Design a protein around this ligand. Structure first.
Ligand SMILES: CNc1ccccc1S(C)(=O)=O
Ligand SMILES: CNc1ccccc1S(C)(=O)=O
Ligand SMILES: [Ca+2]
Ligand SMILES: [Ca+2]
Lengths: 205, 205
């Protein structure tokens, strides 16, 4: 009876942790979309902690975790001292690109546009910090012809403020990513914890 | 409409965070009661993070936070390098004693027994580490006559393994605290998130 009770309790804790992960993902998406930097930081810390208390993951929960990790790396895209992988050479935007290619999602036009904007900016952020040799190394790791050769020419000329980086800017990458985040927000707005909390708030109006 | 929606969303996030705090407190109590050291550590990290995302606290939520903080200091009672207060001189058991005296709860016989056991052990843990001068300083900060004079005599004799510390031992303090934790477990087992999760598990049996 003691082991049977402990077992049912552990199963209930796993159910509640899954509900907490979905809610925290929704809150993280909304903070990213709104540009609420401090709320994003605190929500990320909460999400990471809840994830460490989870063991079995369904395919849906792994996709949710990948979305949280992807937005965290994009938020840190210009923080070149942040090490997100065991290989210390991988920059934050290169780490976001790896997760973007692993998520079980449709490869629609928006998917490829975000992918190519992260590739251009992974090089651009190195150039803007005067890290010319690092830009060439990020280029080799990513690329792994017309798009490729324009980028290599810009790296070799050390043209940091090139007009190419203004046409495919960091702001344009953020805006395209926010369009994708809006779809995730619509999909997760109906998850258990947010629905129950919204019902309580509405009943008091 | 944009500010009105943002407002309702923030209210719903506060409701869900309150439900998460109660659930995490219940899980932390159960890990402490069971002696599941690693689960206690991970649950504490999750609790701390959720608490940083909360702003307005009801009297009930402040009591819940005090219970989490109290068990954390008791779990760290023998870690004399842990600094829980801005005043670096305060030891973990002295910090647990301060919280124990601040919780809005009945001062029954069990309350006073736990209080006195934490006082004896706050000195005992210093003696057992050979920190005789620190034991005298903890004594002065706490005490703050027959109980008092026996303790001062033991500190002055440097009688670390005194039979007094075996009669009012660290294990006896932990057991009395676990009795109190069982009452908190019964009280919080009916909170929203645990009840809903338990209903899901049961419906699959
Ligand atoms: C489990 N990882 C996780 C979860 C949520 C947000 C960020 C991360 S991280 C530290 O990998 O960027
Ligand atoms: C808000 N503080 C908190 C919450 C839960 C568990 C432990 C703590 S602490 C770091 O103060 O020991
Ligand atoms: Ca670097
Ligand atoms: Ca110390």
């Amino acid at each position: 009876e003691e082991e049977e009770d402990a077992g049912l309790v552990a199963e209930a804790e796993a159910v509640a942790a899954g509900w907490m992960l979905d809610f925290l993902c929704l809150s993280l998406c909304r903070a990213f979309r709104d540009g609420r930097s401090e709320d994003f930081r605190r929500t990320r810390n909460s999400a990471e902690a809840i994830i460490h208390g989870l063991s079995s993951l369904t395919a849906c929960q792994l996709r949710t975790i990948y979305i949280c990790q992807f937005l965290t790396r994009i938020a840190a895209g210009k923080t070149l001292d942040a090490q997100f992988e065991n290989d210390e050479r991988i920059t934050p935007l290169e780490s976001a690109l790896m997760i973007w290619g692993s998520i079980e999602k449709e490869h629609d036009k928006l998917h490829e546009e975000i992918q190519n904007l992260i590739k251009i900016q992974a090089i651009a952020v190195c150039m803007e910090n005067g890290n010319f040799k690092e830009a060439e190394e990020v280029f080799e790791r990513i690329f792994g012809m017309p798009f490729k050769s324009k980028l290599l020419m810009i790296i070799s000329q050390k043209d940091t403020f090139h007009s190419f980086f203004q046409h495919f800017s960091y702001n344009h990458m953020m805006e395209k990513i926010k369009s994708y985040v809006n779809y995730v927000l619509s999909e997760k707005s109906s998850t258990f914890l947010m629905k129950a909390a919204a019902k309580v708030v509405e009943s008091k109006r």
